[PDB]
């Protein structure tokens, strides 16, 4: 028997959120964070076992830009990992920071639903000009030589949208189309922090939105069946998540990587098909 190797995992660190999305499948179910040390310890454990891309992830990593910086810092200069990515919502995103961490942030990637401020407000991304702010991250990234990566939720509200002339203006190297996912325990009722349910599309309405994209380079889409099981999932005490089969495991803190590993599904079928090792290096 073999243990599957967690090439590219994601770390969400915290729960906590300064936006409200209404299908958030990542919901801020407890403000628990690990001490440093613990962290750097888990991430090292990671590499230990084959990891070679680590994603952070939440809730929204730049409410914690000192702890997230120093963790981007240790991945690349003392885990000499392959990729350093971050996903955010970017409105905590400062310059300053940026250009502090560059050297050691391969990818930055920012949430984007909509380019019409109307729909942003109506989906729980909120008010004001978003639209500004994710144009200033993607200048400050190729400022700064970080791959910018750009990450949209498909829903019931926004598949019509067309996008392509922000697209072919921001140029990401990396454009994940998602369609939106229900979560066991996290977005799937009237009891969970979030009720994702009014913005679930059929695959038909998924398609609209995928056909008239896809010729970008950067089109990643990813409907329902390759993101259900398709990805490592760390939590806030680094303990492994089974988000399709609602489990969680010890930590790896406690257990190590390959126990907590033998309780999730990882499906590496999937994970390849829609291109989860790819050139995450920045040249
Ligand atoms: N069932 C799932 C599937 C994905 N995710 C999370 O959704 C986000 C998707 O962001 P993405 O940019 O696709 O993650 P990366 O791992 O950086 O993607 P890639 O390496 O393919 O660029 C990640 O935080 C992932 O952990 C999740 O919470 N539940
Ligand atoms: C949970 S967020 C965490 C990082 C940051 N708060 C942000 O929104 O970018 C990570 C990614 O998951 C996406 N996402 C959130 N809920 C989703 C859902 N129900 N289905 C699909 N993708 C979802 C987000 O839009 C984002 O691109
Ligand atoms: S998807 Fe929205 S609510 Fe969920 S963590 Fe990101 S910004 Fe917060
Ligand atoms: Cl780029």
Partial sequence: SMGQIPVSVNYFFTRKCNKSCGFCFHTAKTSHMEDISRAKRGLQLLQRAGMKKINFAGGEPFLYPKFLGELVDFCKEDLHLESVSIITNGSLVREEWVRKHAKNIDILACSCDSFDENMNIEIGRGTGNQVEILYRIAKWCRKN?????????????????????????????????????????????????????????????????????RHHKSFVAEPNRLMASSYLLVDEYMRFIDKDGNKLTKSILDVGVEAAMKEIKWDVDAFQERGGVYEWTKE
């Fill in 145 to 213: 030589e970080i791959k910018f990566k750009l990450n949209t939720v498909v829903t019931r509200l926004n598949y019509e949208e067309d996008m392509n002339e922000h697209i072919d203006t921001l140029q990401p190297f990396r454009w994940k189309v998602f369609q939106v996912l229900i979560v066991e325990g996290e977005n799937d009722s009237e009891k969970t922090l979030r009720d994702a349910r009014r913005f679930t599309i059929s695959d038909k309405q998924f398609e609209v939105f995928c056909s008239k994209h």
